[PDB]
Amino acid sequence: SHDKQFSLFLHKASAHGWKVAFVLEELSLSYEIVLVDVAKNEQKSPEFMKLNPNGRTPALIDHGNSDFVIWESNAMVQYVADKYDTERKISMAPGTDDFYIQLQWQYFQGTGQGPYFGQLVWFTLYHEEKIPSAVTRYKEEALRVFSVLERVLSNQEWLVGGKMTIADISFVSWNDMIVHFLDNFDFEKEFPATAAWHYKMLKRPTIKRPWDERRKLMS
Amino acid sequence: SHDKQFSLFLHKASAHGWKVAFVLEELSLSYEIVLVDVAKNEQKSPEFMKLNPNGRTPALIDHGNSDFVIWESNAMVQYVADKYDTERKISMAPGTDDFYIQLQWQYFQGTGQGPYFGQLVWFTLYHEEKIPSAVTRYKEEALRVFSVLERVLSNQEWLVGGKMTIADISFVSWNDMIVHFLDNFDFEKEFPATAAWHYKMLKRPTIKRPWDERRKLMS
Numbered sequence A, B: 001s002h003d004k005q006f007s008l009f010l011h012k013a014s015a016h017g018w019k020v021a022f023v024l025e026e027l028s029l030s031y032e033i034v035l036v037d038v039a040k041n042e043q044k045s046p047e048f049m050k051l052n053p054n055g056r057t058p059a060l061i062d063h064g065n066s067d068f069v070i071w072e073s074n075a076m077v078q079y080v081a082d083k084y085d086t087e088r089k090i091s092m093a094p095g096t097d098d099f100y101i102q103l104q105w106q107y108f109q110g111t112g113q114g115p116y117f118g119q120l121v122w123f124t125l126y127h128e129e130k131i132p133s134a135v136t137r138y139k140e141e142a143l144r145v146f147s148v149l150e151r152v153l154s155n156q157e158w159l160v161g162g163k164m165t166i167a168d169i170s171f172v173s174w175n176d177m178i179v180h181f182l183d184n185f186d187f188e189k190e191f192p193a194t195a196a197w198h199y200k201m202l203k204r205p206t207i208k209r210p211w212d213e214r215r216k217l218m219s
């Protein structure tokens, strides 16, 4: 293996693993990405399923913590943040009321943005029958998810606590992947405040290089 | 309008608010079910969006925390299990590594079970045209979720800590609902560990009470 504190197993095409990569980079935590070859169904391999019985990437092993294994990308984020962000540069303090709001937005991301964007992708590209009513249903719902973000981000700087947190960050990877799936999408034209919020973050070198590494791999 | 500690807004045919209802029951907390009618599109009214900008049930108001507002059913559950369950009857210690294994499972529930269960129900009843293949896709997926739980509960009686936790509890309402959207489905024969695990919890009068009330308000 390596000497890194974290082993982060991802599918290169996925939004989820790179989101943990962002959070890792923001926190100056050492980590080593291990590609899972989903094309070969390595994610359904017994080796991988010892890490995550769900058999879907990502999974994280914290070697700096007794080789502690954990999956579900949102929880990976929370774990890494609650534990290693002592000075709370990009997280709300545990136990405080803001922490649970932060948590709400992370659920909005993982339950609301994730699954729905994914269905839109599914029916655009991968579903075995071309169904416009289904593609339409999730196109609509992805737009609706921008509107929800715009509803807040046009009134406040960040999702929670007057600063950029892991809650804001969670949304970046999918938000950037989803645009190809939307008809003539003009992000700053259609959702001005959410666009600025997305680009501000994606501009950060701690988020720029991981996503740059993603881009090189996908080509 | 009332004098209980919580104002739980939910829609009756939804798994989510009842998931929070169970926990409020388990924690010996008073609360007032405020019905928000989805058939009436009441989740999209100015007043409920003042509480949840996503315009989706459920949402929580803690009158013991100065009318605190929070949504995302799993984020709500996490708030009250953390702020109240001090004896830790049905929670892990906030700060322990078990806590984040318990969070992982709630995310699997929130992101994995809910959305795919939800899309099964949708293409069966509410989608504007009838698509066997879409119905077939979420059936498959829903069954897959069961095999994930089963792979786990056949080797340990609980998800985390050797105790019943909000991790386990949060699967209950969706698991009881989905069974009728599967053809020729025999829970025990198909997923024996999960079957027993589910039913067990569903016996608990803590759990059995609000779920009984969901039955009447659905007659």
Ligand SMILES: N[C@@H](CCC(=O)N[C@@H](CSSC[C@H](NC(=O)CC[C@H](N)C(=O)O)C(=O)NCC(=O)O)C(=O)NCC(=O)O)C(=O)O
Pocket (backbone or CB within 6 Å): A107, A111, A112, B011, B013, B014, B015, B016, B038, B039, B040, B043, B055, B056, B057, B058, B071, B072, B073, B074, B118, B119, B122, B126
């Ligand atoms: N992650 C969120 C999930 C919240 C959630 O799913 N809320 C639902 C509960 S209503 S229950 C599920 C609801 N069903 C319906 O809207 C069908 C009801 C019928 N059309 C009628 O006439 O009442 C639904 O959203 N189906 C689509 C899907 O599941 O993807 C809701 O508010 N839906 C209203 C809306 O989204 O506008 C949480 O846990 O809090």
